[PDB]
């Protein structure tokens, strides 16, 4: 584990992360997809061999020795707010189990269900809070990746508030 486990946020492409493993914001069918998923496909295409997995789950596939944890958040266009909230929390709990099993000291993670799966709603606080609930009991250094300047500021504020 990390000597003093921390949370940090960076505004940049997660495909250029400086961590020991990455979490992909995957679709259930293991397709190249869009956004983070397409960037992950271009950087680690080998990790998409048998990566299909249901909503609310995570499935790890190596690219060489580098782990890619495919986490499938719900598409809020399809689920009700109640059911989607439950599956979003579940996807993050499965990420925590995989990070622990892998024994890594750091992990790069995006905010699940905040892009094309958001159903057109701002889900920063909802997704980030489920990320904290799952990852708080792990000892890996967590680095959250985002692309928007206002989101970077809000995530950074939420991290610092708890310290
Ligand atoms: O790329 C994202 N979501 C993926 C869900 C499956 S997909 O439709 O292929 C795109 C992101 C999540 C957060 C920021 S971007
Ligand atoms: Cl970048
Ligand atoms: Cl998304
Ligand atoms: Cl963002």
Swiss-Prot record:
Membrane topology per record: Peripheral membrane protein
Stretches assigned to the Macro domain: 4-163
Binding site for ADP-D-ribose: 13, 27, 35, 115-117
Effect of residue 36 to E/F: Almost complete loss of mono-ADP-ribosylhydrolase activity
Outcome (variant: residue 36 to A): Partial loss of mono-ADP-ribosylhydrolase activity
Membrane-spanning intervals of the chain: none
Impact upon substituting residue 13 to A: Partial loss of ADP-ribose 1'' phosphate phosphatase activity
Highest taxon of the lineage: Viruses
UniProt subcellular location: Host cytoplasmic vesicle membrane
Post-translational modification, as annotated: Phosphorylated by host on serines and threonines.
Signal peptide positions on this chain: none
Function: Seems to be essential for minus-strand RNAs and subgenomic 26S mRNAs synthesis. Displays mono-ADP-ribosylhydrolase activity. ADP-ribosylation is a post-translational modification that controls various processes of the host cell and the virus probably needs to revert it for optimal viral replication. Binds proteins of G3BP family and sequesters them into the viral RNA replication complexes thereby inhibiting the formation of host stress granules on viral mRNAs.
Comment, domains: In the N-terminus, the macro domain displays a mono-ADP-ribosylhydrolase activity. The central part called, the alphavirus unique domain (AUD) has a zinc-binding function. The C-terminus region, also called hypervariable domain (HVD), is mainly disordered and binds several host proteins. This intrinsically disordered domain contains 2 SH3 domain-binding sites and 2 FGDF motifs necessary and sufficient for the formation of nsP3/G3BP complexes.
Assembly and binders: Interacts with mRNA-capping enzyme nsP1. Interacts (via C-terminus) with host G3BP1; this interaction inhibits the formation of host stress granules on viral mRNAs and the nsp3-G3BP1 complexes bind viral RNAs and probably orchestrate the assembly of viral replication complexes. Interacts (via C-terminus) with host G3BP2; this interaction inhibits the formation of host stress granules on viral mRNAs and the nsp3-G3BP2 complexes bind viral RNAs and probably orchestrate the assembly of viral replication complexes. Interacts (via C-terminus) with host NAP1L1.
Entry protein name: Non-structural protein 3
High-level lineage: Viruses, Riboviria, Orthornavirae, Kitrinoviricota, Alsuviricetes
Full-protein interval shown: 1334 to 1493 of 2474
